[PDB]
Amino acid sequence: RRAKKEMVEANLRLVISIAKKYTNRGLQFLDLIQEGNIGLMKAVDKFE
DNA sequence: CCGCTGCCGCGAATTCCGTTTCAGGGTACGCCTGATAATTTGCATTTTAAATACCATTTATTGGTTACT
Known part of the structure; x- marks a missing residue:
C-alpha cells in the first residue's frame, strides 16, 4: 500500500492534463x- | 493601552403589456452476456341460430237459433 501511494501521488499532473x-x-x-x-x-x- | 479606520453585508414602487419556447461542449473502439420487450398459445365467462319448462289473466271462437223482411 505505502508503495502504491508514491506512484499515485507522482502522476496527478498527468491526470490533470x-x-x-x-x-x-x-x-x-x-x-x-x-x-x-x-x-x-x-x-x-494493472501496470507491469 | 478601549480609540479609529476597512472590510463585508443589506436594501432600492405598482399593476398590465410585448416577446424571439430560442440557440451554445468539440472526446473511441469492439466483445460476451443477461435482461427485457417484444411476439407466439389455451381458458376462463359471456352470449348461444335459439331450445327449452311452467305459471298466468284476457279475447277468440262460440253452441248454436227463435222469431219473422
Missing part, C-alpha cells in the same frame, strides 16, 4: 479530475 483536455463545459473540472484519479489507481494496479 488528460482531464483538462475534456473540461470544455462538461461536468466540472474537479469531478473530471477525481474520476481520472480513480482511473489512475486502477492503472497503477
Whole structure:
C-alpha cells in the first residue's frame, strides 16, 4: 500500500492534463479530475 | 493601552403589456452476456341460430237459433 501511494501521488499532473483536455463545459473540472484519479489507481494496479 | 479606520453585508414602487419556447461542449473502439420487450398459445365467462319448462289473466271462437223482411 505505502508503495502504491508514491506512484499515485507522482502522476496527478498527468491526470490533470488528460482531464483538462475534456473540461470544455462538461461536468466540472474537479469531478473530471477525481474520476481520472480513480482511473489512475486502477492503472497503477494493472501496470507491469 | 478601549480609540479609529476597512472590510463585508443589506436594501432600492405598482399593476398590465410585448416577446424571439430560442440557440451554445468539440472526446473511441469492439466483445460476451443477461435482461427485457417484444411476439407466439389455451381458458376462463359471456352470449348461444335459439331450445327449452311452467305459471298466468284476457279475447277468440262460440253452441248454436227463435222469431219473422
